[PDB]
Amino acid sequence: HAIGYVWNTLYGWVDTGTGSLAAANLTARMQPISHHLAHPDTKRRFHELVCASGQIEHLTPIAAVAATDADILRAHSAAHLENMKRVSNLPTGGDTGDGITMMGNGGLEIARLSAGGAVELTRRVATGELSAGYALVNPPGHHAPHNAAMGFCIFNNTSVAAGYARAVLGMERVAILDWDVHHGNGTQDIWWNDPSVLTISLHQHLCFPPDSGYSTERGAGNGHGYNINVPLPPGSGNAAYLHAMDQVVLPALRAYRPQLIIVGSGFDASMLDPLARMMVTADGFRQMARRTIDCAADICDGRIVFVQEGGYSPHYLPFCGLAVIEELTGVRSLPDPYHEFLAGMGGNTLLDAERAAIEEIVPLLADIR
Amino acid sequence: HAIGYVWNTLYGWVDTGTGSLAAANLTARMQPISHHLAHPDTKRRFHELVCASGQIEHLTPIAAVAATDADILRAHSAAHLENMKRVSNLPTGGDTGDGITMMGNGGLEIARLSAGGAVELTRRVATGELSAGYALVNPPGHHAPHNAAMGFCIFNNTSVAAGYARAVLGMERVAILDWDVHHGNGTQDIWWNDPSVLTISLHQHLCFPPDSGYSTERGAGNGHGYNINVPLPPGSGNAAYLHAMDQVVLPALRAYRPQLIIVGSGFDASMLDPLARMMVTADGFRQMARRTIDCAADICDGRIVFVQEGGYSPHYLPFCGLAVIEELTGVRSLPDPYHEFLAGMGGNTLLDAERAAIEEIVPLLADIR
Amino acid sequence: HAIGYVWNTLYGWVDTGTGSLAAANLTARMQPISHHLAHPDTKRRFHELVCASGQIEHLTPIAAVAATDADILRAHSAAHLENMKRVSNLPTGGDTGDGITMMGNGGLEIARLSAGGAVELTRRVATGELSAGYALVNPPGHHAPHNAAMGFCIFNNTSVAAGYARAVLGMERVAILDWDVHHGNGTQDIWWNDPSVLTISLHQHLCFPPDSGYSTERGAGNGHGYNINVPLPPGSGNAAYLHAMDQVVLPALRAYRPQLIIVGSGFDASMLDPLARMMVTADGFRQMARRTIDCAADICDGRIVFVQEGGYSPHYLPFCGLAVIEELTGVRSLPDPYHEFLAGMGGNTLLDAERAAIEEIVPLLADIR
Amino acid sequence: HAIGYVWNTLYGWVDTGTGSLAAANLTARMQPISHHLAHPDTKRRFHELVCASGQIEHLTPIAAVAATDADILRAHSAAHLENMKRVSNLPTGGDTGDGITMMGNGGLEIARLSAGGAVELTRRVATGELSAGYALVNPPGHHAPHNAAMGFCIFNNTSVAAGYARAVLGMERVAILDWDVHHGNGTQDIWWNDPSVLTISLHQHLCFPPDSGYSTERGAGNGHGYNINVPLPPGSGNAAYLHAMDQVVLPALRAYRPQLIIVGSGFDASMLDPLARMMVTADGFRQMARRTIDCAADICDGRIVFVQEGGYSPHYLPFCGLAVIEELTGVRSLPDPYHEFLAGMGGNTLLDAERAAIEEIVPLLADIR
Ligand SMILES: Sc1ccccc1C1=NCCCN1
Ligand SMILES: Sc1ccccc1C1=NCCCN1
Ligand SMILES: Sc1ccccc1C1=NCCCN1
Ligand SMILES: Sc1ccccc1C1=NCCCN1
Ligand SMILES: Sc1ccccc1C1=NCCCN1
Ligand SMILES: Sc1ccccc1C1=NCCCN1
Ligand SMILES: Sc1ccccc1C1=NCCCN1
Ligand SMILES: Sc1ccccc1C1=NCCCN1
Ligand SMILES: [K+]
Ligand SMILES: [K+]
Ligand SMILES: [K+]
Ligand SMILES: [K+]
Ligand SMILES: [K+]
Ligand SMILES: [K+]
Ligand SMILES: [K+]
Ligand SMILES: [K+]
Ligand SMILES: [Zn+2]
Ligand SMILES: [Zn+2]
Ligand SMILES: [Zn+2]
Ligand SMILES: [Zn+2]
Incomplete structure (x- = not known):
């Protein structure tokens, strides 16, 4: 039992600009x-709470190591990598393509450290030095497809880590479980034709991007059946999320028998997030993490790596993230001070529409071999 | 056609403290x-957009006049008023009772100007000097019941205005239509036993406060039937809101024949608000305002007064508010720059659960005499 | 008589970026x-204090009118104007030349309104509609020479106004008195060869720019003797500033007999400014303003226009500015709350090195014909 | 040899309120x-630069250990300690006495960690585990006298450390060299009657407090001659500071033969500080640190501990601090990006009034036995 933890000062220095979005x-x-909505203070406040709560005393700090060009090319095109070098060299940086994805001057250094934090944690868990860990990286990753930056994401951190686990560590089966509230379209794209990386995305239906994440997006060729989207309706809370975990996500992982589970751990499904309409509380995320860690313990010798994705409440995200860290360490030493305030708002009963959205995915489990 | 507009510098100076909530x-x-979530910059950005968009050129600026003790006592107890004097006198101000409602040092001055802005606009619309108007006040009002401050609200601005319209202007029937996403519990309390102020609250069910806003809260004594709650489920968007307007809110106003309609105009039902889970866009609020203004034109000679309540997106609230101002002036000169980005997320189809929540209130319309 | 006052919302929307300087x-x-050091909130806090103090009740609000190309060309080259049109188009704007002068996207609109606010106030004062006024503009002007932007300045607002007074209003003599703590190198450049605009700059020696503001910079040709620099040493306070006013500045104005005095009114000589090392307090600026307004009363029918330049203390600048406004209105209704705290730090005794710096300029007064 | 470095997350969480000062x-x-002027972000930006610059790779991180009551009582009265326990309990904290010294809620924890960081580093240096170090603590200390908090300071961190070195480590002579730009009145008070702690304060004359720091304040009783104030005039820069070091400070240390030198390392003498009028640059602080570390090498086996005091430029303080850290590590890997910009403003020539102020203290050196 040794739990790795990645933070780097530069994760807090990402220049999101002077716009809102x-x-x-x-x-x-x-x-x-x-x-900006995606300002780095939100994730820095999570890190500072990990330190100030005393959880850091139960963690093994792991230094991020900059992702090399070779690391990045396992998930992305050469053209994308060169375009990010170009934008990063600009005197004040600039937008990377989609109009909402600012990179500051020199920002490629931070994008390399973000992907590299995921890779380093993955390596050190895979060897057995660490039993598990949390890489609190920034910028996020899951919207970046093979050939572009998108949706605040420069490189697809979890896919860079998966590509490393495949090519460098020789793993035959890796799973990426994305519970960021937005569709993991980038991850879906990268591994679309590939059955060696099972890609799962639990998300608010059509929240972002506007035209993806449907249950009918299932991969192609030998990868057909190895991408699983679980779109949920706006207003879904802990009951829906936990029902999705029990009925779809955990059974999929059990069927697939990954050698490593990489969790795209966003907290933008929280009750107070501006960028989605879901109702998950810190106790919900706690239960989600407990279930997933215990699943890995039953199937891939506890090799599970959490990698930060989105989340936009500087107020509440820190407590959602702390709950997940506590499930990793097993040291539960601080309450969620918003618990009573949010517990009265609901999401705690599984609604028929929520249940039906989840049940749509159950027949797809049989195609995971 | 002369449209009043109230802003006061001190509305932007409210000291919400150094906490989150x-x-x-x-x-x-x-x-x-x-x-803080309720920081005054959000509403100041709305005001600045009214100015910078050029809408101000079509508005008649109206000065706020501090609400007197007599004005406040038409809606609140003497004890509540003295307690707010006490807190305001403290060197750094302080919480007003419920743990989430900070008032800065001297903050009673701002609370008087906020209620007084609503009163002044009400007076000047009622006389016919103005045909309608928008009072962009802060702090908000609708959670403050007769004997307390609550939920960021010091005095119940719309109830101070209604009390003035009743006692000073001799109106026999006033309606308060609250579309802030949170239950107008304070307004409900103040006029609970009183059929001369019809109180309507369209809100997310159990969002805040945790134990109120049920359809069964209908008033008492001669006021029984003259409070109408329309609780909606999380994730409700433009289709639900407009169906609520058409099926419940507008028919209630038509039945009641108020001499003045006061709109508790919050924008925390917006798609990007951190403090609720609804999906209304600026175009939704636009349609809501158009319908309500046109209703007043058919029933109380256009005497409608909008008074700012909540809303917590500094990014998006300004465009939601501008849309309402544009419906008042009839000058539609700036697009919502988020329109396409948000229109893809949904809320545009009336879901069965949303429809059923609204239909629950329709049989109560017959009790409005 | 009537005192004009210019503010525009867009003065507070200047995008200074994400850097420090x-x-x-x-x-x-x-x-x-x-x-950023030059963030617009500093000047907006001054405006909001003018409002909240009640000083606005004694002022005649004057709308800014965008400076036309013709207006700008009275002070600047066509090449500079065309370059500003070009930069204003960049999607996030950018630096204009010197590496410290950011213009946001569409930012030429604001630059035109800033210069235009100075012109419009000048027009109304010079025609006798108003007796005097204060144009609280942003961005500032005095570092922009004929052919460039520099030092946060896009156009030379006071020189645009002086050019208007000369060419449109037919004044033969105008004076620009700049007491911004930095050398008014732009103004000096524009009128270098021209005796019809007397340019005076009281500043900290070599603060900014690093190589100008020497007493030996006196103009050329017909303009020789019609530029007066008064470089003062770091740490100069009220005593030095008032001695400079009495010994050099006011005698220079009296000798010249301008038909209009334009004051480049920066407050970066204040005791708490980060961008200079001077010790002027709000009472200092009060006395400087009183002296200058009284001079104007005796030499040009009271025709004096104040135009905002720099100042970088959001804490203290508002009180320095308010003191000047109070001298214009003659209504002295709010104390400087920092008065006792700052008065104890000194600067109230004329030091020998300060006296000597001032006395260096006295022999140059005889060349003002 | 090994260089210690203290930071704690809670140093960055000090609640300075919603005021300016x-x-x-x-x-x-x-x-x-x-x-607020004293907001913790300024010192946090210094810490983050220590990390991001790579200087941390050459430092030995040292955890702060909370100062005990016994530790605090070596510098302060029991009444003061008990008053701080009382105030720390207030729900939003509050001012501690002088009207400019806010302690947030539970804020005694941070005050103990600040003093404790100084003590722990002192312990490890004095025992020979480390050769020297920098304790980047907050809140600051040097204004707090024996029986009070003052000037943003709750406990006198350097005096707590000196008291520990005396009583626990058995040192007979300790020196505290304070180059924060404000007079170290608290330190002066605590050791006023005590020749076993030589207290030296280099400061801007009468900057803060308004009535102390005169050269005639020399201690009393057995301590007479063992307090040395070096008041300098406003506008003093590198030349004055280095002349003071060479003529007074270093000779005083050599005469006294301390067994430990504690530096009260403020950076509020910098060229860009809002809270004083001095002209020191990062290269100035570099040279001051180099001189002092080299002095320690020749008089007390290199036993020197730097403890953060004030400094209020979030823009520039980090580079002033980094220069000191680089002198400790001997790894000079990042330029001061402001060097050329600030070097042109002056302060690099010793003025007669500066020289004279320094020379006033030289005759007092002979009384240090
Ligand atoms: S998390 C942290 C934050 C600020 C200062 C130190 C630490 C820390 N880092 C790893 C060892 C234990 N503590
Ligand atoms: S994820 C899993 C995998 C293999 C075997 C069991 C489980 C599991 N799933 C649901 C109940 C607890 N454990
Ligand atoms: S809204 C505004 C904002 C800043 C400056 C002036 C105005 C303004 N107020 C009323 C008249 C037209 N303009
Ligand atoms: S609110 C109203 C009141 C009296 C008469 C008609 C209406 C009305 N209601 C719905 C359709 C448009 N107008
Ligand atoms: S300065 C101001 C600020 C906010 C709202 C109104 C005014 C104002 N403007 C001109 C007339 C008197 N008051
Ligand atoms: S303009 C002037 C210049 C130098 C000295 C005095 C004055 C002056 N000020 C007001 C009263 C009469 N004249
Ligand atoms: S200074 C720092 C900041 C953020 C994350 C890690 C460190 C760090 N701390 C001590 C070992 C080397 N690096
Ligand atoms: S401590 C000292 C004091 C005054 C002058 C020189 C030194 C000194 N510094 C380093 C080399 C030898 N001694
Ligand atoms: K796949
Ligand atoms: K997802
Ligand atoms: K009622
Ligand atoms: K409501
Ligand atoms: K000239
Ligand atoms: K000047
Ligand atoms: K002493
Ligand atoms: K000092
Ligand atoms: Zn997301
Ligand atoms: Zn609300
Ligand atoms: Zn300046
Ligand atoms: Zn200081």
Whole structure:
């Protein structure tokens, strides 16, 4: 039992610019603002709580090591990598393509450290040095497909880690479980034709991107059946999320028998997130993490690696993240101070529409060989 | 056609403290933050957009006039008023009772100007000087019951205005239509026994407060039937909101024949709000405002007054508010720059659960005489 | 008589980026920050204090009118104007030349409104509609020479106004008195060869720019003797500033007999400014303003226009500015709450080195004909 | 040899409130602001630069250990300690006495960790585990006298450390060299009657407090001659500071033969600080640190401990601090990006008034036995 933990100062230095989502724009009358929705303070506050709560005393700090070009090319095209070098070299950086994905000057260094944090943690868990870990990286990854940056994501951190586990560590089966509230379209794209990386995305239906994450997106060729989307309706809370875990996610992992589980651990499904409409509380995320860790213990000798994705509440994300860290360490030493305030708002009963959305995916489990 | 508009510099100076929601607390490890959820910048950004968009050129600025003790006592107890004087006198102000409602030093001055802005606009619309208007006040009002402050609200601005319209202007029937996403429990309380102020609250069920806003809360004594709650499920969007307007809210106003309609105009039902789970877009609020203004035109000679309640997206609230102002002026000169980004997320189809929640209230319309 | 006052919402929307002074730069390890030194909140806090103090009740609000190309060309080259049109188009804007002068996207609109606010106030004062006024503009002007932007300045607002007074209003003599703590090199450049605009700059010696503001910079040709620099040593306070006013500045104005005095009113000489080392307090600025307004009363029918330049203390600048406004209105209704705290730090005794610096300029007064 | 480095997350969580200096106050029209002058982000940016620069790779991280009551009582009265326990309990904390010294809720924990960080580093240096170090603590210490908090300081961190070195480690002579720009009145008070701790304060004359730091304040009784104030005039830069080091400070240390030198290392003498008027650059602080470390090498086996005091430029302080760290490690791997910009402003020539202020202290050196 040794739990790795990755933070790097530069994860807190990502320059998201002076816009809200897209850039500030005077003609549109979008006024500049200090904190973009994706500002790094949200994840830094999580890190600072890991330290200040004393959880750090039960963690093994792991240094991020910059992802090399070779590491990045296991998940992305050469053209994408060169375009990010170009944007990073600009004097104030710039948008990377989709209009909502700012990279600051020098920002490629941070993107390499973000992917490299995931790779390093993956290596050190796979060897058995560590039993598990949490890589609290930034920028996030799961929207970046093979040939582009998208949705705040420069490189697909979990796919860079999976590619390393496949090519360098020789694993035959890896699973990426993404519970960020937005569809993991990038991860889906990268491994679309590939049955050696099972890609699962539990998300709010059509939240982002606008036209993907349908249950009918199942991969292609030898990868057909090895991508599983679980779109849920807006307003889904702990009951829906836990029913999805029990009915779809955990059974899929059991069927697939991955040698490593990489969790795309976003907290933007939280009750207070501005960028989705879900109702998960810190206790929900706690139960999700407990279940997933215990699943890995039953199937891949506990080799599970958590890698930070999204989440946009600087107020509440830290407690959602701390709950997951506590499940890794087994030291449960701080309450969620919002628990009573949020527990009264609901999401705690499985609604028929939520149940039906989840049941749509159950017949696809039989195609996971 | 003259449209009043109230802003006051001090509305932007409300001191919400250094906490997120409750105060910062080191033992709980709730780290201080610059912007409380209810920080005044959100509403100031709305005001600045009204100015910068050029909408101000079509508005008649109306000065707020501080609410007197007599004005406040038409909605609140003497004890509540004295307690707010006490808190306001403290060197750094303080919480007002419920643990989430900070008032800064001197903050009673701002609370008086907030209620007084609503009163002044009400007076000047009622006389016919103005045909309608928008009072962009802060702090908000609708959670404050007769004997307390609650939920960011010091005085119940719309109830102070209604009380003025009743006692000073001699109106026999006033309606308060609250579409803030949180239950208008304070307004409900103040007029509970009183059929001369019809109180309507369209809100997310059990969002805040945790134990109120049920359809069974209908008033008492001669006021029985003159409070109408329309609790909606999390994830409700434009289709639900507009169906609620058409099936319940507008028919209630038509039945009641108010001499003045006061709209508790919050924008925390927006798609990007952290403090609720609804999916209304600026175009939704636009349609809601158009319908309500046109209703007043058919029943109380256009005497409608909008008074700002909540809303917590500094990014998006300004465009939701601008849409309402544009419906008042009839000058539609700026797009919502988030329209396409949010329109793909949904809420645009009336779901069965949403429809059923709304239909629960229809049989109560017959009791409005 | 009537005192004009210019503010525009867009003055508060200038996008100063994510750097401190220059841009953020990751290889230099210059971490992004929310508020650049020149962030518009400093001047907005001054405006909000003018409102909240009640001073606005004694002022005549004057709308800014965008400076036309013709207006701009009275102070600047066509090449500079065309370059500003070009940069204003960049999607996130960018630096204009010197590495410390960011213009946001569409930012030329704001630059035109800033220069235009100075012109419009000048027009109304010079025509006798108003007796005097204060144009609280942003971005500032005095570092922009004929053919460039520099030092946060896009156009030379006071020189645009002086050019208007000369060419449109037919004034033969105008004076620009700049008491921003940095040398008014732009103004000096524009009117270098021209005796019809007397340019005076009281500043900290070599603060910015690093190689200008020497007493030997006196103009050329017909303009020789019609530029006066008064470089003062670091640590100069009220005594030095008032001695400079009495010994050099006011005598220069009296000798010249301008038909209009334009004051480049920066507050970066204040005791708490990060961008200079001077010790002026709000009472200092009060006395400087009183002296200058009284001079104007005796030499040009009271025609004096104040135009905002720099100042970088969001804490203290508002009180320095308010003191000047109070001298214009004659209504002295709020104390400087920092008065006792700052008065104890000194600067209230004229030091020999300060006296000597001032006395260096006295022999140059005889060349003002 | 090994260089210790202390940071603690909670140093960055000090709640400085919503005022600028004193609290926000509505009747005074002192508008709330996000960042108080003393906001903890300034020192956190220094810490993050130590990390991001790679300097941390050459440092031995040292955990802060909370100062005990016994530790605190070596510098402070029991009454003061008990008062701090009392205030720490207030739900939002509050001012401690002087109207500019906010302690957040539970804030005594942070005050203990700040003093404790200084003690722990002192212990490890004095025992020979480490050769030297830097304790980047917050809140600061040097204004807190025996019986009070003052000037943002709860406990006198360097005096707690000196008291520990005396009583626990058995040192007979300790020196505290304070180059924070404000007079170290607290330190002066604590050791006033005591020749076993030589207290030296290099500061801007009468900057803060307003009535102390005169050269005539020399201690009393057996301590007479063992307090040395070096008040310098406003506008003093590198030349004055280095002349003071060479003529007074280093000779005083050599005369005294301390067994440990503790440096009260503030950076508020920097060229860009809002809270003083001095002109020191990062290269200035570099040279001051180099001189002092080399002095320690020749008089007390290199036993030197730096403890953070003030400094209020979030932009520039990090580079001033990093320069000191680089002198400790001997690894000079990042330039000061402001070097050329600031070097042009001056302070690099010793002015007569600066020289004279320094020379006033030289005759006092002979009384250090
Ligand atoms: S998390 C942290 C934060 C600030 C200072 C030190 C640490 C820390 N890092 C790893 C060892 C235990 N503590
Ligand atoms: S994930 C799993 C895999 C292999 C065997 C069992 C489980 C499991 N699933 C649900 C109940 C607890 N454990
Ligand atoms: S909304 C506004 C904002 C800043 C400056 C002036 C105005 C304004 N107020 C009322 C008249 C038209 N403009
Ligand atoms: S609110 C109203 C009141 C009286 C008469 C008609 C209406 C009305 N209601 C729905 C359709 C448009 N107008
Ligand atoms: S300065 C101001 C600020 C906010 C709202 C109104 C005003 C105002 N403007 C001009 C007339 C008197 N008051
Ligand atoms: S303009 C002037 C210049 C130098 C000295 C005095 C004045 C002056 N000020 C006001 C009263 C009469 N004149
Ligand atoms: S300074 C730092 C900051 C963020 C994450 C890790 C470290 C760090 N701490 C001590 C060992 C080397 N690096
Ligand atoms: S401690 C000292 C004091 C005054 C002058 C020189 C030194 C000194 N510094 C380093 C080399 C030898 N001694
Ligand atoms: K796959
Ligand atoms: K997902
Ligand atoms: K009622
Ligand atoms: K409501
Ligand atoms: K000239
Ligand atoms: K100047
Ligand atoms: K002493
Ligand atoms: K000092
Ligand atoms: Zn997400
Ligand atoms: Zn609300
Ligand atoms: Zn300046
Ligand atoms: Zn200091």
